[PDB]
Enzyme design. Sequence first.
Site, PDB file in Angstrom:
ATOM      1  N   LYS A  25     -17.629  25.559  24.171  1.00 37.10           N
ATOM      2  CA  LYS A  25     -17.731  26.012  22.796  1.00 37.10           C
ATOM      3  C   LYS A  25     -18.523  27.309  22.740  1.00 37.10           C
ATOM      4  O   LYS A  25     -19.526  27.465  23.438  1.00 37.10           O
ATOM      5  CB  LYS A  25     -18.388  24.940  21.927  1.00 37.10           C
ATOM      6  CG  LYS A  25     -18.336  25.232  20.442  1.00 37.10           C
ATOM      7  CD  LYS A  25     -18.850  24.065  19.623  1.00 37.10           C
ATOM      8  CE  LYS A  25     -18.750  24.363  18.141  1.00 37.10           C
ATOM      9  NZ  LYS A  25     -19.222  23.227  17.311  1.00 37.10           N
ATOM     10  N   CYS A  61     -14.525  22.985  16.343  1.00 40.50           N
ATOM     11  CA  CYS A  61     -14.712  22.775  14.904  1.00 40.50           C
ATOM     12  C   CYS A  61     -14.716  24.026  14.032  1.00 40.50           C
ATOM     13  O   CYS A  61     -13.831  24.194  13.188  1.00 40.50           O
ATOM     14  CB  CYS A  61     -16.025  22.020  14.689  1.00 40.50           C
ATOM     15  SG  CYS A  61     -16.426  21.677  12.966  1.00 40.50           S
ATOM     16  N   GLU A  68     -12.818  15.551  18.834  1.00 41.80           N
ATOM     17  CA  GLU A  68     -14.000  16.245  19.325  1.00 41.80           C
ATOM     18  C   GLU A  68     -15.083  15.244  19.698  1.00 41.80           C
ATOM     19  O   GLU A  68     -15.330  14.292  18.950  1.00 41.80           O
ATOM     20  CB  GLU A  68     -14.533  17.205  18.263  1.00 41.80           C
ATOM     21  CG  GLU A  68     -15.723  18.034  18.717  1.00 41.80           C
ATOM     22  CD  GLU A  68     -16.299  18.891  17.611  1.00 41.80           C
ATOM     23  OE1 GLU A  68     -15.795  18.812  16.471  1.00 41.80           O
ATOM     24  OE2 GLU A  68     -17.261  19.638  17.878  1.00 41.80           O
TER      25      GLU A  68
END
Lengths: 289, 289, 289, 289, 289, 289
Positions: A129, A163, A42
Site C-alpha cells: 500500500k 482502499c 482487504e
Amino acid sequence: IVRATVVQASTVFYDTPATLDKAERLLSEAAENGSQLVVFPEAFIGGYPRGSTFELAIGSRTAKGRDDFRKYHASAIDVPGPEVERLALMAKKYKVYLVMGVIEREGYTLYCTVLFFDSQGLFLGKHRKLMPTALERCIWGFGDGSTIPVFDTPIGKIGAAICWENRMPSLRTAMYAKGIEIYCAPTADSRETWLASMTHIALEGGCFVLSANQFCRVCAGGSSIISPLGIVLAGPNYRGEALITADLDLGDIARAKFDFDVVGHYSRPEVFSLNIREHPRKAVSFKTS
Amino acid sequence: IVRATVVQASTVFYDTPATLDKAERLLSEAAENGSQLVVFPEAFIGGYPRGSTFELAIGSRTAKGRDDFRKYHASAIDVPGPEVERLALMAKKYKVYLVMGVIEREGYTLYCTVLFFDSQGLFLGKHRKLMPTALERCIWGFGDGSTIPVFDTPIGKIGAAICWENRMPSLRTAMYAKGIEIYCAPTADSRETWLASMTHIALEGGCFVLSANQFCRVCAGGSSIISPLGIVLAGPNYRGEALITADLDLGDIARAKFDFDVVGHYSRPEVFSLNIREHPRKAVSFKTS
Amino acid sequence: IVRATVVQASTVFYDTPATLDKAERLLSEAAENGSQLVVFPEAFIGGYPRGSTFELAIGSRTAKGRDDFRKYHASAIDVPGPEVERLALMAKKYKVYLVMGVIEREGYTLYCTVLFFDSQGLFLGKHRKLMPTALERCIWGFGDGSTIPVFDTPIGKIGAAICWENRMPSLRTAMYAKGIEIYCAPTADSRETWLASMTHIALEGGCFVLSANQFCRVCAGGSSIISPLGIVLAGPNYRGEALITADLDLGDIARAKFDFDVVGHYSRPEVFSLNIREHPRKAVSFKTS
Amino acid sequence: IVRATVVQASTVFYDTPATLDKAERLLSEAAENGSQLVVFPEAFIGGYPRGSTFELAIGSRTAKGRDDFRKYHASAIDVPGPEVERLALMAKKYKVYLVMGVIEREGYTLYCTVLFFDSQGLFLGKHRKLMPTALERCIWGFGDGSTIPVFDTPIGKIGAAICWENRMPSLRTAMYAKGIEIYCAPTADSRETWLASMTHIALEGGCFVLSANQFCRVCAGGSSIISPLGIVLAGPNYRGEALITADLDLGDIARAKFDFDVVGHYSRPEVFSLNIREHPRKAVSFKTS
Amino acid sequence: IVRATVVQASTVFYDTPATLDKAERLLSEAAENGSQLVVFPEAFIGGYPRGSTFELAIGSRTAKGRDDFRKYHASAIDVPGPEVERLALMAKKYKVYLVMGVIEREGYTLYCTVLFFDSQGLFLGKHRKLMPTALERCIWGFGDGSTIPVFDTPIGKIGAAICWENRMPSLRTAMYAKGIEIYCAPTADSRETWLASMTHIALEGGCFVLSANQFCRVCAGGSSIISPLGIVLAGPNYRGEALITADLDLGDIARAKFDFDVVGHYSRPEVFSLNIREHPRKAVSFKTS
Amino acid sequence: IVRATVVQASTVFYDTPATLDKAERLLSEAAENGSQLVVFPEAFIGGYPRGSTFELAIGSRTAKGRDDFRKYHASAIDVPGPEVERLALMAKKYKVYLVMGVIEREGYTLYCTVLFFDSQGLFLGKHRKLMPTALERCIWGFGDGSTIPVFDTPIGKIGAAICWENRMPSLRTAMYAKGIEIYCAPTADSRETWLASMTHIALEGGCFVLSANQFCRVCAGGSSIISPLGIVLAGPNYRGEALITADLDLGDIARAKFDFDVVGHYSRPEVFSLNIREHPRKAVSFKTS
C-alpha cells in the site's frame, strides 16, 4: 470470455491458522460452479481492527496500548514463508487465478499488502500500500514506488489497488498507461459513496472494476462488478454474506474505448506530461564480494 | 457564506440577438431572491446542434452540408465585441458574478469557450475547450495550454471545465494545484452516469461542484449542486425547466479536507511528479518596431 | 564568548495575535541583561494541542472532530506574511539572534516548522519537520530533504532539530558533517529520559546542546544547556516557568574534540559511507515563458 | 524469557594461565543460580595496562619502553589455539552461552577482540575492534569490515561492541539493520557519562543493553542492564565487585517498538541511504593449485 | 642539467605569519646563486612539537593537555586560503619550482601534507601522509589512496614522501611504476640510520634522492643529495644550519638503469603482481540537482 | 638465544671433490667453539667464474668459448645425488643447522641454487635463484615461483635470498608475510654499497640479517651480521679470510617491532594489495596409469 467471483466473508480476527480453512472451503465452493478468478477482501488473513483506538491521545501512551499492539503483532504473516506455500498448494490443485489481501511483517513493522497467484502455483509478486489513510499511519508503513505491477496473463492484464488509493488521480493514470483491463480493488468501507466512486473509475478506464468488501458482526460491506459502460452486472449485496459471480466479455473493451480513450488519443502530450520515479530504495545496503 | 444558482433553460438556436433577452429576464428573476452567482449551460449563446450529422460519410461532402455549416457559422459571436459589452452592462447594474457558455469565432473557426464576469462589469478572462469529444472535432477547434484560469474573488476561487474535460485525471489534478473550491462544470448530456461522475469529483476535491445542463424539446438535462462530503443539496431536476438555488458554507471545506487532502499531504512527491507546459503558442507571429 | 537564553513560557493556545505580545515582553526581559541568542519552544505560535484525540477510531470520523480541526486550523500562520514581518521588526530593534518554533499552513495543511532571524532583521530560512511521531501524522505533514540548514553567523554555526528527530542516527551524522557547534533542539516532552538523551548528543558532537520546553497548566517541561564535555551549566528547571541564562565559551570545542572527533578522524571511510539526496521535489510544477 | 548475568571481577594482569581459573570459579558461581548468559568485561584474559605510558614522547623511544612492551606481548593468546579449547570445554559441560573479551596476537601485533560460544561447545566467531581510541593506537591494531556479526541463537540475536564504538552513529545503525535485540557492550571506563550514554542506545534501539566493567585496586567500574523503555533493572554497582543478575522479557520489544521504530518505518529512504563495504581485505594473498 | 637546493632552517613554532618571512629571505638567498628547485623540511609552517607528550597515559586526559592541543591547533593553515596565495605570489616573482611541508586543518583535524608549486604561480596539488608513525596517531589523521602524484614538469617528474613512508616496500614500488626520477623526501629524524636507508632507495630506484631535515635548539638534522649510483654529492651537514646546493645530470639515469632496472625488465610479472586501489572515499557525500 | 657463524673462504674452482674437504675442516673448526648455524657463501661448490667473458660479442661465438663452457659444465653437481648424501652425513654427526650455496645441473643447464639441512641429517628443500643479474643470463637459468621457503625450526624461521634478489621490493614483502626472523643472504660482490643496502633490510624487517661473501686471490668480500635495530655486531672483515661468530637474542625482535611493524599494522590493506602466483610450472608433463 472469462468469469470471476468475489467473496464477502469475514475473518475470525485471531489465531491465523484457523482463518485459513475458511478460505479453503470458500475456494472449493467457488470452484464447484466453474469459476476462473477469485478475489478476497482487504486485510483478510491478518485481520482488520475495527473500532479500536489503542489509547493514543497526543503521546500519552498508556500501558493498555502496548499489550494490544503486541497481541495484534503476533498474528501476522511474512513472505515468503509457510503461509504462502499453503496458498500456492491451494491454487495449484486445479486451474484458478488467486488474489489475496494479507498483512505482512518485516522486522516489527506491518505492511498491508496484496498477493497474486497463477494457475500453476507460482508466486507472481505483490503490491504494498502506498499510503495508509488517517489512523492506520500510527500502526502501518509506507510502500515505495517499485511495486506497481503489470502481471500479464493469458486471460488479460490484472492489477490492484487498496482502499483510498483509488481516489488519487496520478496513481490511476499510472495504472492506465500500463494497459489494465481487469482492475481489482478491495476496500474496508461501506457507504453509498463507494458505488458512485467506482462508476467513475469504470467509465474513465475501460476496465472491469471488481471490488470486494467483508461482512462482520456492523459495517455491512457491499461488493459488486461493473461493466466499462457503467452497467452494474451484480448488485451491491447488503443482504448478509454470500458468493457473487458474473461473466466477463473481453470484447466489451475495444467497443467501449471508441468514445473516450484515455492515455491514447486524448490526454494532450503537448501540454501535460507525467513521470513516475520507480526505484527500489532501501535504508541500509550491504555489499560484499 | 454565499449562495449560487444554476439555470436549465434552452436557446432558440437561431437569431442570436433574440436569445439574449431570455438571459436578461432569467437574470432578473434570479436577482429578485438575493442570489450572488449565476451559472449558464454549455453553448448557450451560439446554440448546440443536436442530432444533425452534416452528411459526412468518409469524405463524400455532399452539397447539403456546406449551406448547413454556413447557416450555423453566421450565428456565432466574437470576443471582445458588441455581444460582451451588453453582458458586462447586464452584470454591471447590480452585484452578481456571471459565468456564461458562449461559442466564439476566430477567422472562420469555432471555439466552444466560456466567459467570466465580476460584480463591477470587468472582463476577467475566458477558458477555451481543450479537446472536443467525438464528432465536434469536425466543426470545432482545439484550445491551448495558456488558458486554464485561477480567478480569485472575494468570495473564493472559481474555475470551470466543459463536458468531457472532467474525465481527464491530469486536468483535474492541475485544477486542484491552483486552489479551486467552487468548481463550475456545464455539460450537454443527461444520464444517470453524470451524477455518479460528479460525486467522485466532489469527493476527490473539496470543491462545491456546481453543474448546469439545458432542457429543450428530448434530452432532459438535470443540474444539481453537491457538497464536498458527497451530499446533494438540490436534486437532479428532470421535471421541466426551472431555477435551482442553494447556499454555500465556505467553512465546510477546511472540515472536509481533514480526511483525504489531495495535492497536499497525500500525493507522494517522492514517486509522482507532474509538469504542465503553459505557453501561448500561435502559428504566425508578426514583429515590428 | 557569547551567551544565550532559553524560555519556558506557554501560549494561550487560541487567538494568535494575543500570544505575540507575550513574546514581546519576554524578549524585552531577556534583552535587559545583555543576552545575544534567544530560543523559544516547540509550536509556540500555533499552539500544541495536548490530550485531545479528535475522535479518530479507525475511520469512524464523528462530527465532533471536524469542527475541532477547523477551529485549530483557523489559528495558524503562513510564511512569508504579516506575522513574520512583525518578528523581523522585533529582532531589528536591537542586536539579538532569534529562533522561533511556529506552525505554518500551506493550502489546508499544517507543517511544524522552525524559523531563523539575524541581528539585521533579515529572514535566513526555515527547517520543517522530517517526520511527525505517532499521532501527529494524522494532522501534520512531512518535510522534504532540501531544508536542512547551515546558517553560518559571526558567532558560529547554528542548526536545529525538533522533538524526535534527535533520535535518528543518520540525521545527526548529517548535521555533524556540515559543522554544527550550537545545536538548538526544542521539544514537547518532560521525562528523565530527555536529559540522558541529550547528554549523549552533547558528547557525540562537540556542540553546545541548547534545549527548550514549555510549562503549562501538567507536563512540567525542563530546559537546560549542556557543555560539550557533559557538564550541565544550568539545571533542569522544573520549578515553574522562568528565564534561563548561561555563557558559552567557543574555545571549549577545539579542546573537546581531542578525544573523540566524529566525521573527521574517526568514522572509517574505507568501510562506511553515507549519501544524502537533497532535492526540492514538488508534485505539480508549472513552467512558462 | 531468559536471564543473563554480568561480572565485575578483575584479572591478575600477568601469568595468563593463572587468570583462567578465576573465570572457572566465577562461571560455576554464576551457574548455581540457573543463569543462561554470562558476559565478561573488556580485555579480561590479556590484561588492560592502566596508567602506564611506555615513555613515548614524540619519538624519543627510551630503552624502558621496549622491555615493558615485550613483557606485555608475552602474555597474550592466539586463536584458534590451546586457550580457546579450554573455554569451549568450559562452556560444553552444561548449558550456557558465553561471550569473552580477550586480547589476541597475530604476528607481533595485538588485536582487542571479543569471542562467542554457544551451549554445545562450538566456536561461532569473533568481533575485532574497529578503531582504538587515543593512546591504544600506539600498541594495538585496526579491524576490518568483514567482522560485524549477527549470531542468531534460539533465545534471540546477540551482538557486541567495545568501549568507544558505541558512540559512532553509523556502526549502531549498521547493527540495527541486522536485527539486534540483545546488545552486549563491555568497556573500560567509569563515569556518570556512561550510564547516560547507554540509556540513549537502549531507547534508540529496542535492545536489552547489557554492559560490563571491571573493578581493580582505582577506577570503580559499574555494570548494569537496561530495559528498552529506559528502566534500569539492576543498578550501577559501585560497591566492590560482585555478580549481577536479572531476567529478560523478550515480549518487551514488540511492545517497545510501537513508538519509535528505527530502520523500519522511520528513517526515510527517500532522503537518507547508507551502504557498508564488507570485504575481507588482506595485504599478501598467496594463491596455489 | 638542473640544479637544486635544500634548506636546514627551523621555524619559530608559534605565530605562523612570522615564520613566513624567514621563508622569504631564505628563498631570496637561494635565488641569488641561480638555483632552480628548493626543498623545505617536514612540518615547516605548522611546527613540529618535539618532546611534548600532552599527558596521555591510557585515557587519563588531564586538564593540561587540552589547552596545549588548542594552542597547537590555533597555529595551523588551511588550503586553499590566504597562506597559499602568498606562496604562489612568492614563487611567481621569478622562475623556481617550490615544494613545501606544511600542516593543514580540515574541520578540527590535522593532516601533515606537502605542497607543490610551479614556475608560473599555479597550484599543482598536494600529497597527504598515509599513516603517522607512533605517537602522531593521537593528534594527526590518515590519508587516502587518491593522493599519490606524478607531476610531470619540463625538467623531469618529481614526487614526494614523508618521514616513515620511505620504509614501506609497496609505496616505493608504486612510486617507481609512475616514473619518478627526482624523489624528494623530507623527514624529522637525525641518525646514522637515515643515510644508510636513503642509499638503498637511490640504488633501488634510479632517482636523485633529495632529503631535507631541520636544525633547532638538539636533534641536529643532516640533509644531503645522492646520485643514483650511490655517490653522495653534498655531505650530511651536521655543522649548524646552512644552504646546500648541487647540480643534477639527467643523463645519469639512462646510464644507471643498465644494471638493475626495476619495474621493467626485472620484477617477473609471471609470479608477482600488484594492484593499487585509488579511490576518493569520503564519509558523507551530498548530492543535489 | 642461539649463535651463528659465517665463513669467508674460497673454493679451488675446479675438481669439485677436492673443494669438499675444505668444507669439512672449516665445519669442524666452526664446531669446536659451540656454534649452532653455519652459512656458506654464494656458488661455493660449483665455483664462480670471475672475470671470464666466454667471448660473446653479439653472436660471434668463437671456438674458445665452447670448450670453456664444457670445462665449467663438467664441474657441477646434481640433486639429489652422491654430493648431498655426504653433506647430510656431515651435518648428521653432531647438532648443527647447515645452509650451503651450490650450483646444480638439470639436463645441460645450470641453476644457482641454495640448500638447507637440519640437525638430524634430513633434506628440507632448496631455493633456486629467481633471475640472474646481467651476464649470468647467458649461462644460467631462471627459477619459478614454487620455490620460496618457510622452513620453521625449533630455533626460529630461516629463509634465504641470493645476490640481487635482495633489491626487489616485492620479493622482500613476500618474505616478510611468511614470518622470517633469520634472513640469510649470500652474495658475490664487495662494495661500501652492500653494508648500506643490508642496514635497510635489517631495519625494514626485524630479522637478523646474516650475509656471507668469499675472499680469493682481488674482490675482498666482507661478511657481517646486523641486529634488527641497525647495530652491527661483527664488522665487515676485509682483513683476509677468517671465521666470524656472534650470538643472537631472539627477544630482540618483539621489542624491535614496536615502532615500525611491516605487513601487520602498517601496510594499509584498504589501498595496497599483493598476490603471488606460486605454481610448479614445467614444460612437458607425462601422465600415465
